[PDB]
Structure formats: C-alpha cells, structure tokens
Design an enzyme around this catalytic site. Structure first.
Site, PDB file in Angstrom:
ATOM      1  N   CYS A   1       3.994   1.109   9.282  1.00 20.07           N
ATOM      2  CA  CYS A   1       3.942  -0.001   8.348  1.00 20.07           C
ATOM      3  C   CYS A   1       5.336  -0.294   7.834  1.00 20.07           C
ATOM      4  CB  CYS A   1       2.945   0.293   7.203  1.00 20.07           C
ATOM      5  SG  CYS A   1       1.288   0.136   7.877  1.00 20.07           S
TER       6      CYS A   1
ATOM      7  N   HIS B   1       0.803  -1.224   0.000  1.00 16.31           N
ATOM      8  CA  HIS B   1       0.000   0.000   0.000  1.00 16.31           C
ATOM      9  C   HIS B   1       0.843   1.284   0.000  1.00 16.31           C
ATOM     10  CE1 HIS B   1       0.233  -0.508   4.531  1.00 16.31           C
ATOM     11  NE2 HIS B   1       0.272   0.812   4.481  1.00 16.31           N
TER      12      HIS B   1
ATOM     13  N   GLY C   1       2.636   5.641  10.073  1.00 18.45           N
ATOM     14  CA  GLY C   1       4.016   5.555   9.624  1.00 18.45           C
ATOM     15  C   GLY C   1       4.791   4.331  10.104  1.00 18.45           C
TER      16      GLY C   1
END
Ligand SMILES: [Ca+2]
Ligand SMILES: [Ca+2]
Ligand SMILES: [Ca+2]
Ligand SMILES: [Ca+2]
Lengths: 302, 302
Positions: free
Chosen positions: A147, A43, A145
């Site tokens: 991920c 993503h 932030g």
C-alpha cells in the site's frame, strides 16, 4: 511475425526518488514525498484488528504529528502537520524533497494505461504497467506492505500521479485511490467483502490491437463489411464490451493502415463468436491491454 | 481468479543515471557509462551505407579519440581512449560517472528473465522485461536509434548487466551482445539476412506457470500420472520444448503446492496436444514467459 508490442512502463527513476516509509504505531506502508507533503493511505492509522469497517474520523482525531514516522531509505522527515483527504493522508514535513519532479495529479479512465512503482517499506522493488479496467480495478501484482505504491503517467517531463494502492479484491485484482482521495469505482478502503462490478473488454483497446496485427501483416479478419459505431455500441452493451469512442490516436492507425474503424468493429463482433482456430498476433482471443497510444508509439514511433 | 502475475521489471533509476549518447560521424546511438568507461555498439563507427557486411577492424583503425562524441542529457564527456571488444566499443572518458552503481557483467541463459531500459538519443524512454528465447533472441520493442539500450538483472543492490541491444531480425524479434562483446547465439552485427534458429517453449517456465495456476486454485490439468524428467526430455526434443532442468526455485513450488514436477511434466505433454476448450490462468495455450523466480516472488513473496 513478432508484433514488437511489450508491456512498456515509464522509466521509474523520477518517482523512486519520491518514495518513503510511513509508520504509525504497528502499521507500516509507503508514501509519496513531493515538496513538503507526504501522501499515504489512511489505513496506516488503523490498528490491524479494526481494518474491517474502521472509523477513520475518530482515528484521525486520536493522532498527533508525533504519531507518524516518515523515513527515506533510498533520512528522517519530521511530521509537522497532518490532514486527511478522502482515503489518503496528507502529511506535512519540515523538509522539502529536493528531487520533487514536475508533476500533476490526475484521474485515469477505464482502458487507459499507467505505470506502477511497487514498493515495500519505502523501497521500490519493481515496475509494471496496467490498464484501468472498466470496473475500476487493475490486474496488478501487490503483496502485503505494498500500500502506498503509486501509479503515474508521463507527459514530457511532467509526472501525472493517478493512483495510490490500497487493496486487493476477492478475485485477485487490485484498486486504490486518486490523489483527490476518492477510491476508484464504488470501492471503500475497508477490509470487508464488497460487490465487484463485472469487467468488460475495452473496445477501443481491442481495435488498437487489431490495427497492430495489420501493421505486422496479419489481416485475415478484415472484411469489406462494416459496423457503425452506434450499431457496435448497442451490440457492445449486450456482450460485455465497452462502448467505442474513437480518438485521434485511433484515426492515425486507420490512416496508416487504410482500414476503417468500422471494418474492425465488424471484425470484433465476428471474432467474439470465435477465431475458428486462427490466430491474431499469436493470440486466439481478443486482447485489450494495449492502447492506441501504445501501438502508435511502439510500432509506428509516433 | 486473477493470478497476480505481471511482467515486472526492476526499477530503472540506477541504470538511467548511466545512459549517454554516443555520436560518431553520422551515426548516433546509446552507451552505458560506468566509472571511466562508456560501452556502446561498434556499428556506431559504421557509415549508414556500409552497414551490411562492414569491416570493423578497418573502421576502428580509421578512428581517433576525437571521432567519438559522448553526451549526457539526463554533460560532455571527453573521449581519451578507445578500444573494441567483440561487437562493442569500450571508450575511456576523462570523467568517472559519480552515480556508477555497484555492478557486474554476466551472460543470461535461455529462459531467464531480465529488464531492459529502452533509450533514444541517450534519453531513457521505457522499461520492460523479457525472457531470453532458446534461439538467443528476445521479443522486445526497439526502434531506430535504440541500439545501446541495456538489459540487466539485479541481485540486492548489484546490477548485473547482461545485454546491449544491436539489431532486429527478419521475424521482428531482437538480439544484442553481452558485455564480453559476444553476440548472443550465432548472430553477427551485420545488416544481412541471417539464419534464425527455431524458438522453443521453455519447459521450466511452463512448469512455473502451471504451478502459478495451482497457487491460484486452478488445477484441473493435474493428474496422478507422472512423466520422468528423462522421459519428458526425450519427448521435448521431438516437440520443440527445451529439456527441463529443475532448480531450487521449482522445488519450492512443488513443496508449497504438494504437486510434483513429474505430474506437471505429464500435464504439459497432454496440454501440448490441446486444452479441450478449458483455460489456465485465462490462457488457452502454454505460457513460458514467467520464470519460477517470478512465481516465487510475485505470488509467494519469497
Ligand atoms: Ca515492428
Ligand atoms: Ca525538481
Ligand atoms: Ca495472489
Ligand atoms: Ca556509486
């Protein structure tokens, strides 16, 4: 008195040296740099106004090597190849990480523990340890932030990467993918409401904890009464407990204490109905966040 | 639902590169290598049959530079000077650690949290985080051979070393020294029974935890009733609570939630008598192992 049990993580130095920042347009997150490959959640390709039900196959086609920007803060790594495996991207870079540890990829199973390196903008900020819940979530601590933060176990010097963080569920728990690209459980990497399966007590971890109590002199819950594994497991299914599956690590605890697994299975059944004001290792409720291995290592030094 | 609170440690890479093995005769333990100095517990000088009430001044005189053997596993560091500061040895070596972080030495105060790198034979094996208890013990996880393991906080890139592990008390908790050589509390580095002061609940940490509950939608314990700081603190002294001392980090939580400190002080008084079967953040008893800073960082991202 004090059990000598803490939430213990692996030392994180080896993995810290593998963390990088991956930027693609207006999204930024963390990646894992091993050899000439950088792994990161897919993503990152996604614009922040399509994150619910995105089409990643189309997004992927629209990217080139120059769409991705990889930076090490703790260099600039030129992306020279890009591919998608399930919910991860696999970016090839021109420079091989000279601090690549010896590593494998593996999948972690419910009730097993692993260590997490939480990271923001490619900068490791903390470490903690979690148990994979029976519903394939973890009770972590992740913000915007995070991920691309990674989870791993360790066997000797070999790092077994098992988790790359992807998302937070409606009830505040977290999930992510294995490095084969599959999300844990039935989850998808889409920002929509998804059914969450019910969690359960990890029976084997509760047993480990009761043994830890015995090793610290707390044994009032132990009776001669016993419950068979088969009988417990039928009971478990009706009471939101995992079915119990013994292991060599649990057997060691039974040998060291002289208390049989089946006595503690009976104990769990009775304790689930109530502690009657008594305490176990300071707790008035069952504990399933410590594994038999944690107990063997931290209390017995095995 | 899930609070998003975990026991979070600093990433340990910086400190891992500072750990060494110190051997003196038949005792071996860990040291901390910064610049041209190696710090380690002084009972490494001690023969294993004098560890109760040893004379360290005499032991020190009997040592030379050649008595000590320092090895890095993760080199051989020739000892060229040796001194004692309180309960630590300060060994000077010919080679300066080229991975010395920017660091300070500081003392940690009751209720404050720090990260520990547990080590055996100079080999880092795990990391965890603890709160200094009001009786100057920690609830850690240390085995034989863990002395010299270090505790530290972090401000930006600067590592503030605050703890070097020395011993385990009769009740299973642990203590050690600051890098000025003083043992925390009234403890001595002798293997004899020592009085242990009573522990207390860290009021400020309980308040932080109640705020964390409010930030996760759990607020049934909040009433308009208020208790003054001065009134609470008189109550605290009779009920095994630390006196409360607000801070800017607690004030931020009061601002973000719109619940005043004094409302939560009243709440603590009532909860100490009983939760009446209700739960707070999954717990049925007060929690004082999370600090206001933990809550600000992990839940609010501050
Ligand atoms: Ca113990
Ligand atoms: Ca390597
Ligand atoms: Ca949250
Ligand atoms: Ca340096």
């Amino acid at each position: 008195h004090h059990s000598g049990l803490v939430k213990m993580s692996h030392p994180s130095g080896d993995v810290e040296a593998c963390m990088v920042q991956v930027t693609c347009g207006s999204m930024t997150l963390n990646g894992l740099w091993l050899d000439n490959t950088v792994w990161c959640p897919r993503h990152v390709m996604c614009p922040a106004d399509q994150l619910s039900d995105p089409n990643y196959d189309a997004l992927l086609i629209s990217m080139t090597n120059h769409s991705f920007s990889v930076q090490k803060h703790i260099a600039n790594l030129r992306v020279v190849g890009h591919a998608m495996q399930g919910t991860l991207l696999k970016l090839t870079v021109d420079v091989a990480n000279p601090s690549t540890p010896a590593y494998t990829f593996t999948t972690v199973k419910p009730g097993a523990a692993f260590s997490v390196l939480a990271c923001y903008n490619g900068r490791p900020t903390g470490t903690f340890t979690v148990v994979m819940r029976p519903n394939y979530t973890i009770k972590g601590s992740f913000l915007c932030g995070s991920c691309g933060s990674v989870g791993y176990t360790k066997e000797g010097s070999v790092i077994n990467f098992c988790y790359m963080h992807q998302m937070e569920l409606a009830n505040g728990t977290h999930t992510g993918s294995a490095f084969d690209g599959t999300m844990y459980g039935a989850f998808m990497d889409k920002q929509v409401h998804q059914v969450q399966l019910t969690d359960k007590y990890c029976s084997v971890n509760v047993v480990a904890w009761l043994y830890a109590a015995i090793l610290n002199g707390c044994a009032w819950f132990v009776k001669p009464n016993r419950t068979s594994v088969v009988s417990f497991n039928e009971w478990a299914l009706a009471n939101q407990f995992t079915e119990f599956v013994g292991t060599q690590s649990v057997d060691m605890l039974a040998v060291k204490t002289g208390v049989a697994i089946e006595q503690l299975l009976y104990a769990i059944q009775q304790l689930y109905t109530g502690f009657q004001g008594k305490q176990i290792l300071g707790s008035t409720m069952l504990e399933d966040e410590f594994t038999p291995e944690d107990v063997n290592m931290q209390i017995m030094g095995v």
